[PDB]
Write an enzyme that holds these catalytic residues in place. Sequence first.
Site, PDB file in Angstrom:
ATOM      1  N   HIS A 102       0.800  -1.221   0.000  1.00 50.71           N
ATOM      2  CA  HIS A 102       0.000   0.000   0.000  1.00 50.71           C
ATOM      3  C   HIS A 102       0.834   1.275   0.000  1.00 50.71           C
ATOM      4  O   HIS A 102       0.333   2.318  -0.422  1.00 50.71           O
ATOM      5  CB  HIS A 102      -1.042  -0.032   1.122  1.00 50.71           C
ATOM      6  CG  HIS A 102      -0.584   0.557   2.408  1.00 50.71           C
ATOM      7  ND1 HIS A 102      -0.195  -0.240   3.463  1.00 50.71           N
ATOM      8  CD2 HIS A 102      -0.515   1.849   2.785  1.00 50.71           C
ATOM      9  CE1 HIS A 102       0.115   0.591   4.443  1.00 50.71           C
ATOM     10  NE2 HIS A 102      -0.033   1.859   4.070  1.00 50.71           N
ATOM     11  N   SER A 105       3.838   2.819   8.351  1.00 48.23           N
ATOM     12  CA  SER A 105       3.452   1.798   7.383  1.00 48.23           C
ATOM     13  C   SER A 105       4.655   1.334   6.586  1.00 48.23           C
ATOM     14  O   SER A 105       5.433   2.160   6.134  1.00 48.23           O
ATOM     15  CB  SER A 105       2.401   2.367   6.428  1.00 48.23           C
ATOM     16  OG  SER A 105       1.119   2.349   7.021  1.00 48.23           O
TER      17      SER A 105
HETATM   18  C1  LIG Z   1      -9.131   1.076   3.258  1.00 47.70           C
HETATM   19  S1  LIG Z   1     -10.359   0.390   4.342  1.00 47.70           S
HETATM   20  O1  LIG Z   1     -11.486   0.000   3.501  1.00 47.70           O
HETATM   21  O2  LIG Z   1     -10.586   1.340   5.420  1.00 47.70           O
HETATM   22  C2  LIG Z   1      -9.682  -1.108   5.006  1.00 47.70           C
HETATM   23  C3  LIG Z   1     -10.207  -2.316   4.516  1.00 47.70           C
HETATM   24  C4  LIG Z   1      -9.744  -3.551   4.989  1.00 47.70           C
HETATM   25  C5  LIG Z   1      -8.739  -3.588   5.962  1.00 47.70           C
HETATM   26  C6  LIG Z   1      -8.214  -2.388   6.451  1.00 47.70           C
HETATM   27  C7  LIG Z   1      -8.676  -1.148   5.986  1.00 47.70           C
HETATM   28  C8  LIG Z   1      -8.079   0.059   6.547  1.00 47.70           C
HETATM   29  C9  LIG Z   1      -8.571   0.573   7.755  1.00 47.70           C
HETATM   30  C10 LIG Z   1      -8.000   1.730   8.297  1.00 47.70           C
HETATM   31  C11 LIG Z   1      -6.951   2.382   7.626  1.00 47.70           C
HETATM   32  N1  LIG Z   1      -6.398   3.564   8.237  1.00 47.70           N
HETATM   33  C12 LIG Z   1      -7.342   4.625   8.732  1.00 47.70           C
HETATM   34  C13 LIG Z   1      -6.674   6.019   8.856  1.00 47.70           C
HETATM   35  C14 LIG Z   1      -5.334   5.884   9.476  1.00 47.70           C
HETATM   36  C15 LIG Z   1      -4.481   6.756  10.165  1.00 47.70           C
HETATM   37  C16 LIG Z   1      -4.704   8.160  10.527  1.00 47.70           C
HETATM   38  F1  LIG Z   1      -5.599   8.321  11.561  1.00 47.70           F
HETATM   39  F2  LIG Z   1      -3.589   8.775  11.036  1.00 47.70           F
HETATM   40  F3  LIG Z   1      -5.167   8.945   9.499  1.00 47.70           F
HETATM   41  N2  LIG Z   1      -3.344   6.173  10.548  1.00 47.70           N
HETATM   42  N3  LIG Z   1      -3.453   4.933  10.064  1.00 47.70           N
HETATM   43  C17 LIG Z   1      -2.470   3.999  10.359  1.00 47.70           C
HETATM   44  C18 LIG Z   1      -1.505   3.531   9.461  1.00 47.70           C
HETATM   45  C19 LIG Z   1      -0.582   2.549   9.900  1.00 47.70           C
HETATM   46  C20 LIG Z   1      -0.646   2.030  11.213  1.00 47.70           C
HETATM   47  C21 LIG Z   1      -1.626   2.524  12.098  1.00 47.70           C
HETATM   48  C22 LIG Z   1      -1.707   2.044  13.469  1.00 47.70           C
HETATM   49  N4  LIG Z   1      -0.928   1.146  13.984  1.00 47.70           N
HETATM   50  N5  LIG Z   1      -1.366   1.030  15.277  1.00 47.70           N
HETATM   51  C23 LIG Z   1      -2.428   1.902  15.537  1.00 47.70           C
HETATM   52  O3  LIG Z   1      -3.028   2.020  16.603  1.00 47.70           O
HETATM   53  N6  LIG Z   1      -2.629   2.564  14.335  1.00 47.70           N
HETATM   54  C24 LIG Z   1      -2.531   3.492  11.654  1.00 47.70           C
HETATM   55  C25 LIG Z   1      -4.647   4.695   9.443  1.00 47.70           C
HETATM   56  C26 LIG Z   1      -5.118   3.479   8.824  1.00 47.70           C
HETATM   57  O4  LIG Z   1      -4.454   2.465   8.828  1.00 47.70           O
HETATM   58  C27 LIG Z   1      -6.437   1.861   6.430  1.00 47.70           C
HETATM   59  C28 LIG Z   1      -7.014   0.705   5.888  1.00 47.70           C
END
Ligand SMILES: CS(=O)(=O)c1ccccc1-c1ccc(N2CCc3c(C(F)(F)F)nn(-c4cccc(-c5n[nH]c(=O)[nH]5)c4)c3C2=O)cc1
Lengths: 234, 52
Positions: free
Chosen positions: A42, A185
Site C-alpha cells: 500500500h 506503514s
Molecule cells: C481502506 S479500508 O477499507 O478502510 C480497510 C479495509 C480492509 C482492511 C483495512 C482497511 C483500513 C482501515 C483503516 C486504515 N487507516 C485509517 C486512517 C489511518 C491513520 C490516521 F488516523 F492517522 F489517518 N493512521 N493509520 C495507520 C496507518 C498505519 C498504522 C496505524 C496504526 N498502527 N497502530 C495503531 O493504533 N494505528 C494506523 C490509518 C489506517 O491504517 C487503512 C485501511
Amino acid sequence: IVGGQECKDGECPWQALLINEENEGFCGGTILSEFYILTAAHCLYQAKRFKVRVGDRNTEQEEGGEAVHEVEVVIKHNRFTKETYDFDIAVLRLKTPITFRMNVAPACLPERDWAESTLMTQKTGIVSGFGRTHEKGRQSTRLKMLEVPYVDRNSCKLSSSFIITQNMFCAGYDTKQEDACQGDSGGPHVTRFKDTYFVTGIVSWGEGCARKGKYGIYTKVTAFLKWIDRSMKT
Amino acid sequence: KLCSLDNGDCDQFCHEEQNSVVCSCARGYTLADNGKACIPTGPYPCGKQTLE
Ligand SMILES: CS(=O)(=O)c1ccccc1-c1ccc(N2CCc3c(C(F)(F)F)nn(-c4cccc(-c5n[nH]c(=O)[nH]5)c4)c3C2=O)cc1
Ligand code: NA
Ligand code: NA
C-alpha cells in the site's frame, strides 16, 4: 509512533525510510540484505517515484553514515487490494548495495515454524518509524520505537471493524495510548530472541492511532517467507 | 520437551529430527562446534544492534 522512545545510536539499524521527490519520508521499510528492503504494498501508492533512505535517525540533520538508494525493482504482491488490505507486502531491490555500519544493518529473516512457535509466542515485539506522534500530526523528524505486546488472535478479530486475515496479526495495548501511526506503514516489527532481532511484521494499518480497544495491524512476515526468498533471487 | 525446553538450547532456529534437537542459524551466521551457538561470518550480521 505515538508514545514510545527515540531510537538511540545503533538501536534500530534495520530501519529504512521511503522518500518521495520532495525528500519527505512517507513510509518505512526493513533492511533484509544489502540489496533488499521489505515494505508494505500500500506504500507504493503514496508516491509516483521514491527512493530509500538508510542510517537516518533525524531527518533534519545529515548523518554521514546516512545514504540514499534508488530502487531498481519493485516486487509487489499481486493479491494486494485496498478493499481488504490483505497481502500488504512488497520487496524492493536497490540499484546499489547498502553499506552496513553503525545505524545500518539488516534484520534477520526467521524460518516459518520457528518464528510461529518461538518468536510469535514471545510477550512483545518492537515497532519503529518516522510516522505521526499523535493521530493528528506531522511526520516525526526522529526515528522512534515502541515495545508492543503480541495480541491474542481472538481479541484482535473482536477489536476490529475490518476482517483480520491470516496474513495479518495485532500488537499493541487496549488501554495504554501508545501505538504505530500513519507514516510508520511498511516499517519493521521485529522480535528479539537471545539478543538477535528477527523481522516478524510489516506495519500495515490501524483504526486511528493508539485508540483504546484498538491495535496496530501488521502483515505477518511468516506467511510470505518463500515469496520473500523467491523475490531476493529475482 | 526438546525445542519446547528453552528452544533446545539453540541460539536461533530449533528443529526436531528423530526425537532430537537440531539447531540452525540465519544467513550470515555459522553454527558453532557445540552445534547450538550461531557465530557471525563477518561484520554487521543480521539482527544485531550496532551499539559499539
Ligand atoms: C481502506 S479500508 O477499507 O478502510 C480497510 C479495509 C480492509 C482492511 C483495512 C482497511 C483500513 C482501515 C483503516 C486504515 N487507516 C485509517 C486512517 C489511518 C491513520 C490516521 F488516523 F492517522 F489517518 N493512521 N493509520 C495507520 C496507518 C498505519 C498504522 C496505524 C496504526 N498502527 N497502530 C495503531 O493504533 N494505528 C494506523 C490509518 C489506517 O491504517 C487503512 C485501511
Ligand atoms: Na538524517
Ligand atoms: Na490500542
